[PDB]
């Protein structure tokens, strides 16, 4: 078919395909589907720059994507979302093996957006520790109630999680509430074996 009047539902499924995992977008949601079924400020997004840069990444308009990344909020989440969308489009273009320069520049766009997320994490790290922590761990009400670290590990961004902020977070989560931290492996086998040994093990106060 000509497929004129492409619905926002259909490109929503394209984000379902491209993002992967369990990324439930707002378009795929039945709550938005009843509104879209109704109209064959109600039809006004609270965050226009999000879907504008989603449109820009989907149609390959790179400079518009950077400009929409400049404005609005949740720049980190937007950067990782655009990075995984660009990488997934590059993988689909290599799988369909079209003209190879567009697969090259989709991979280049994915590297650019991932690099932008990296420097942004570095600047947040140099600015404030706990604020960057809360930025890296808070819930993402506009993107499937995920978190930015989940979008990073979906995006396969090895350099983002190789940063010391995420490594510090994974180290904190690794020990959990226990904070003895002196020759950890030998002390934990002395903790499980001979179970009365954790009385000399110090813990985080609430």
């Amino acid at each position: 078919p000509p497929d004129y009047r492409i619905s926002l539902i259909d490109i929503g499924l394209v984000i379902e395909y491209l993002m992967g995992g369990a990324y439930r977008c707002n378009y795929t949601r039945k709550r938005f589907r009843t509104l879209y079924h109704n109209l064959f400020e109600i039809n006004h997004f609270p965050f226009p720059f999000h879907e504008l840069m989603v449109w820009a990444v989907l149609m390959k308009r790179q400079k518009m994507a950077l400009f929409f990344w400049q404005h609005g909020e949740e720049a980190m989440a937007k950067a990782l979302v655009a990075c995984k969308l660009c990488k997934a489009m590059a993988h689909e273009a290599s799988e369909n093996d079209m003209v190879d320069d567009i697969s090259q520049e989709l991979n280049h766009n994915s590297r650019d957006f991932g690099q932008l997320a990296v420097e942004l994490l570095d600047q947040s790290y140099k600015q404030d520790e706990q604020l960057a922590m809360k930025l890296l761990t808070y819930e993402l009400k506009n993107w499937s109630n995920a978190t930015c670290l989940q979008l990073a590990v979906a995006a396969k961004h090895r350099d983002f999680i190789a940063h010391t902020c995420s490594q510090m977070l994974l180290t904190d989560m690794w020990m959990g509430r226990l904070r003895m931290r002196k020759n950890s492996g030998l002390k934990v086998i002395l903790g499980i074996l001979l179970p009365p040994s954790i009385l000399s093990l110090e813990f985080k106060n609430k």
Partner: protein, 355 residues
């Protein structure tokens, strides 16, 4: 003290070390049952091993039920992305097949023994997988996964050259055998071990057509040279040289440059897979596989008694506003720093001086 032991047992590092100690104990239990007599009824050690396998299968079915996608066909797909998971399911099904063969009488009990041996094989690799927690061993496992493709290409080219020489040797020395399936074994048996040391010095260039001396001085009439069988030492020499020297040292060079590729990554992919290890060992219940039945019954009782009748930190609106304002300050600082670095570069100074 109770909250202290709850905090200690709920940590992911303690849960991981508990899991790997239980896995090592299970593996040595497997070794002990596979090395000793298995009678008409299974022993206590075999009961521990089947209990481990069945509870591990129930745990995997539980993680299937408690996955993040809501569509049930999508859960098995997103679990089939991981290769370890599907090979774990394959081995659990193999153990079930071997148990249902072993619990019968003869001759199926020996077939259960074969299945038990190939299951050791798999669980020793899975122990190799479990070692990937170390910041040095994990990169080594990654590199082994990278070199498996070059191994497969070596397998193809060796296969061509080796069974070429095998067909020639099997058809020069042996012109007088009927069609039978032992011909393929003779093709693939003698030329394979030539690469790895022993060259079968007794079985090559035998003196034919000559009354060679026996032990007690009696010249026994040896069978004659059936064909011109001086060809097979020469093509033996050519095959051994080309195979060993050429392709082994080729794969040495291949492994060298692929190690050059993967050493520049090194710890970064380990830090990448650290998150996946974190989430798997935080989602997992506190008790290990042998005793995960206790956790399963207490979670069934909790979710059908008090309910049927991780890194995701929740953030209020004002703290979201503070986080957002911090974010805008950060991106604006970053862009000011980028512009200042670009204006402080040498080429920009040269260009503006020329203008």
């Amino acid at each position: 003290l109770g909250r202290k032991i709850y905090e200690f047992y709920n940590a992911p590092i303690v849960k991981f070390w508990f899991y790997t100690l239980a896995y090592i104990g299970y593996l040595m239990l497997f070794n002990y049952i596979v090395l000793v007599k298995m009678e008409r009824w299974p022993s206590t050690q075999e009961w521990i091993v089947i209990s481990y396998i069945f509870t591990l299968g129930i745990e995997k079915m539980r993680e299937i039920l408690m996955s993040e996608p809501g569509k049930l066909l999508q859960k098995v797909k997103v679990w089939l992305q991981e290769y370890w998971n599907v090979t774990d399911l394959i081995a659990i099904l193999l153990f079930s097949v071997g148990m249902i063969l072993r619990l019968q009488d003869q001759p199926f009990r020996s077939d259960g023994r074969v299945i038990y041996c190939v299951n050791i094989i798999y669980w020793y690799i899975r122990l190799l997988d479990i070692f990937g927690v170390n910041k040095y061993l994990g990169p080594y496992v990654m590199m082994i996964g990278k070199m498996m493709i070059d191994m497969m290409y070596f397998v193809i080219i060796m296969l061509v050259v080796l069974m070429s020489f095998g067909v020639a040797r099997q058809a020069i020395l042996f012109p007088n055998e009927e069609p039978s399936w032992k011909l393929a074994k003779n093709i693939f048996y003698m030329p394979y071990w030539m690469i790895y040391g022993e060259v079968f010095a007794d079985q090559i260039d035998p003196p034919c057509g000559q009354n060679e001396t026996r032990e007690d001085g009696k010249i026994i009439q040896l069978p004659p040279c059936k064909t011109g069988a001086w060809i097979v030492p020469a093509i033996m020499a050519c095959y051994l040289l080309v195979a060993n020297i050429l392709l082994v040292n080729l794969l040495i060079a291949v492994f060298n440059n692929t190690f050059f590729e993967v050493k520049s990554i090194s710890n970064q992919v380990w830090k990448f897979q650290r998150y996946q290890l974190i989430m798997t060992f935080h989602e997992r219940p506190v008790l290990p596989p042998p005793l995960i039945i206790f956790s399963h019954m207490t979670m069934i009782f909790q979710h059908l008694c008090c309910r049927w009748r991780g890194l995701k930190l929740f953030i209020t609106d004002d703290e979201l506003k503070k986080v957002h304002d911090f974010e805008e300050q950060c991106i604006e600082e970053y862009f000011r720093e980028k512009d200042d670095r670009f204006n402080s570069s040498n080429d920009e100074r040269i260009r503006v001086t020329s203008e």
